[PDB]
């Protein structure tokens, strides 16, 4: 019933999702380069369309790039069905306005036809997952139009977006803050939940928690993929009690515009028996809630939580969960009105490279610092109108650039006001 349709938009979107699909295929027991399997485990129907002995991942692959199909065959074999891959003609040169306005009506109609076919092979739609990168030209503007279009066709369906935000210190292109704000404005309006990730945080993790020396994006994507595979464990491995995407939206989002979540996982293990059997839920909870495993450039132990959820995997003792979470409640800071704080869940099936593991998600007021940095960079460039012609000559009015900024500021102000008011909601 809780069938998931993934949408992958742009180069980052496809590489991250690619790593995810190949890890999913390892846990369920499917060949990552063929889709062919004889003996599989878990509820494979949530993510794969099985025809004969081939498990076809349910995904819509989208680009503006002229040769997206060949680019996939070369890395992912025949795992993805070519009928689901939508190729483009020219491309968006890191310009939100091209991905969003000047993309071609036909390109979008084909994406929608593919989505309709994928939702037509389901007894029910459990939700959509969008994987993309906010500073690009297709994963930002086209991915944003797709969220708009999907939410208009399927309102009341939980959309989760996983996206890469600018890094806190160094930036990629000068245009990046314009692409990032307009992408964020559309995430604010259309996603049910958004997971904020960035590369600076992930690199520190790759260099300090993984054994890899001099990691590249290929290694960095295994941290993101690990977040994605763990967050879908309960869905994939069932259980009498479990978590679907609609359970996460209901429990983590207290207001409709405060859905931006942080993510953290531990242990991080590269394939092979390179891990150590710590086997302790208490240690994993202490780690997942520390600042060192957070996949975004923020410092959550200094903020305040509105809500959080923790999913434990493997043979975790009930007694250790209760004690470990008691420690977490004592050490961290929560807002009074939400009085229960957490959503807790367990899935008895172990991740393939560790007997135990933990994934945590949550609403931490600290997240505004990511948005505030983006806002400030935009304001300086916008005031001087540097690289601005690239957006207004591609269909935007100054009004749209200003309204997108205003919406972003509204979310920041709402998170901060709530957080400051919170100090006295206890007296």
């Amino acid at each position: 019933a809780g069938e998931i349709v993934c949408i992958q938009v742009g180069q980052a979107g496809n590489q991250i999702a690619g790593a995810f699909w190949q890890k999913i295929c390892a846990e369920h027991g499917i060949d990552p380069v063929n889709g062919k399997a004889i003996d599989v485990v878990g509820d494979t129907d949530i993510f794969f369309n099985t025809i004969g002995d081939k498990y076809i991942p349910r995904a819509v692959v989208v680009d503006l790039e002229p040769a997206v199909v060949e680019n996939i065959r070369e890395k992912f074999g025949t795992l993805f069905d070519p009928k689901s891959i939508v190729s483009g003609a020219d491309g968006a040169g890191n310009n939100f306005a091209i991905g969003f306005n000047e993309h071609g009506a036909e390109t979008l109609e084909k994406v929608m036809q593919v989505v309709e076919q994928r939702v037509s092979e389901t007894e029910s739609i459990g939700g959509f997952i969008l994987t993309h990168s906010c500073g690009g030209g297709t994963g930002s503007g086209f991915g944003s139009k797709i969220l708009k279009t999907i939410r208009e066709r399927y309102p009341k369906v939980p959309i989760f977006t996983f996206s890469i935000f600018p890094s806190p210190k160094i930036s990629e292109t000068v245009v990046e803050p314009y692409n990032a704000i307009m992408t964020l404005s559309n995430l604010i309006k259309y996603a049910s939940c958004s997971i904020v990730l960035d590369n600076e945080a992930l690199f520190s993790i790759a260099e300090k928690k993984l054994e890899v020396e001099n990691p590249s994006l290929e290694d960095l994507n295994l941290i993101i993929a690990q977040v994605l595979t763990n967050v879908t464990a309960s869905l994939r491995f069932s259980g009498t009690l479990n978590l679907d995407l609609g359970k996460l939206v209901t429990n983590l989002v207290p207001f409709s515009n405060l859905h931006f979540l942080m993510a953290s996982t531990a242990p991080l293990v590269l394939a092979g028996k390179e891990s150590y059997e710590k086997m302790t839920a208490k240690e994993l909870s202490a780690q997942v809630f520390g600042d060192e495993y957070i996949c975004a450039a923020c410092k959550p132990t200094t903020g305040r939580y509105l809500a959080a959820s923790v999913l434990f995997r493997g043979a975790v003792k009930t007694s250790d969960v209760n004690e470990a979470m008691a420690t977490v409640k004592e050490q961290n800071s929560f807002v009074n009105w939400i009085p229960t704080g957490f959503k807790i869940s367990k899935s008895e099936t172990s991740p393939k490279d560790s007997a135990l593991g933990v994934i945590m998600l949550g609403n931490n007021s600290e997240i505004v610092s990511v948005f505030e940095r983006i806002g400030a960079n935009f304001d300086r460039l916008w005031s001087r109108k540097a690289f601005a012609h690239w957006f207004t000559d591609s269909g935007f009015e100054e009004k749209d650039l200003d309204d997108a900024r205003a919406l972003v500021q509204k979310v920041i102000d709402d998170y901060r006001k709530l957080t400051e008011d919170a100090e006295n909601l206890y007296f």
């Binding site: 809780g2 069932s238 009498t240 609609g246 969960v321 009105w337 807790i344």
Partner: protein
């Protein structure tokens, strides 16, 4: 045979089912395939339907708004035992909202559910009543169980309806919207059930942990304790006991006013596997254990509150002269109002478990229930007054006055249970 129909609603009520039903199968000498295993004992007919063949069929219905609790129970944990034509499954689940279970989604399944119930009712000449086992946490349990109860009471008004309401923990089972579903559903249980048992999972977790301080237990112990309490409550409805002979007698013994029907329980030895080796529990210790803090499946101290009714059901030989001295010896730990005699009733029935010398369970109508309700109500108010997560309920039809009504009903219920405290 006064027959009882058991309905399991929601993910937890269903999770419990295999433990509840395995206990009954072993207790009456039936295998898990429904086949007889030697001599059948007890009034088997009250809980099992006899097939056209030698197989016994549990007289039960399983309801889930998603497909998964049922799929695991009937395909992996207790294969071939449950009748697939008595399983009701939706697709969407409940997104943890009361609103789906009671107003927007679960309502489309009521024709299917009432049709299956009638098919089950039609197989019995003398129906005593219904037992509905449900979580009050999640939307399927919190929402549908009262929707189902109302539909039954309006069709079969002369039957006794009992619910087994399980309150989720503030830790392992927690949810950010638990207080909304708990208040919204207590509001309906108040008019739906004749008898409503409240079991608190936090008490189970601390009680078992205390008993287990000397060992590694098993992760299955928490579910076995919860399932066992229902089995023991029902023991007198299955054996020819001199107590709680029928659901109608439980109602007359424990509930003096239509609203004051929320009951607490106490159990000893909790589980056979918790009390192993030398367990000669003398009649004297068993009765002291049953009013001990570590045997009460609620955050209740009997000494702090007032009893309205109290029934102690023991199993095995329990000489009456001992039971009477144990009761007199309760002193002022067990106290009632000045408008009641100390109406404490105790006796014993048949033991089926070859590892225990004796055992027992109590049913209490005690003002301490009001403290659980106030705890949950305070949490409700903090969230409600600042609109936390209310959009998710309003989007599915819960006009705001619906929350306000539940708030007021529960505060009145708390006020009424505490009348004797003042």
């Amino acid at each position: 045979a006064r027959e009882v129909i058991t309905i399991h609603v929601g993910e937890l009520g269903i999770q419990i089912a295999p433990n509840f039903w395995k206990y009954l199968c072993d207790e009456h000498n039936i295998d898990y395939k429904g086949q007889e295993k030697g001599k059948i004992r007890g009034v088997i007919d009250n809980f099992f339907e006899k097939a056209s063949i030698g197989k016994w069929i549990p007289r039960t219905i399983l309801v889930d708004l998603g497909p998964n609790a049922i799929r695991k129970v009937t395909k992996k944990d207790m294969k071939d035992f449950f009748d697939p034509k008595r399983c009701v499954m939706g697709l969407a689940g409940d997104a943890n909202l009361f609103a789906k279970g009671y107003y927007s989604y679960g309502t489309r399944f009521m024709e299917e559910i009432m049709d299956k119930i009638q098919k089950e009712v039609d197989q019995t000449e003398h129906l005593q009543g219904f037992i509905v086992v449900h979580s009050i946490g999640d939307g399927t349990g919190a929402g549908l169980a009262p929707l189902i109860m109302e539909a039954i009471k309006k069709k079969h008004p002369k039957l006794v309806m009992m619910s087994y309401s399980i309150v989720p923990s503030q830790n392992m089972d927690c949810s950010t919207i638990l207080p909304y579903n708990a208040i919204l559903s207590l509001d309906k249980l108040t008019s739906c059930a004749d008898i409503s048992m409240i079991i608190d999972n936090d008490s189970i977790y601390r009680i078992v942990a205390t008993q287990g301080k000397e060992n590694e237990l098993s992760e299955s112990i928490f579910d076995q304790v919860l399932a066992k309490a229902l089995v023991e409550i029902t023991a007198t409805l299955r054996f020819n006991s001199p107590l709680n002979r029928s659901m109608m007698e439980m109602s007359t013994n424990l509930v003096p006013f239509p609203r004051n029907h929320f009951l607490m329980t106490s159990m000893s030895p909790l589980e056979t596997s918790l009390t192993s080796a030398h367990q000669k529990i003398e009649t004297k210790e068993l009765m002291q254990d049953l009013i001990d803090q570590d045997h009460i499946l609620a955050p209740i101290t009997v000494e702090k509150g007032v009893f309205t009714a109290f029934v102690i059901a023991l199993r095995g030989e329990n000489p009456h002269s001992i039971l009477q001295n144990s009761i007199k010896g309760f002193g002022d730990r067990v106290k009632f109002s000045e408008i009641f005699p100390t109406a404490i009733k105790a006796d014993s029935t048949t033991l089926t478990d070859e590892k225990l010398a004796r055992s027992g369970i109590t049913l209490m109508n005690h003002s301490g229930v009001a403290n659980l309700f106030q705890f949950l109500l305070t949490q409700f108010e903090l969230m409600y007054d600042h609109d936390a997560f209310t959009t998710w309920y309003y989007q599915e039809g819960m006009q705001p006055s619906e929350f306000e009504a539940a708030k007021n009903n529960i505060q009145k219920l708390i006020t009424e249970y505490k009348q004797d405290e003042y």
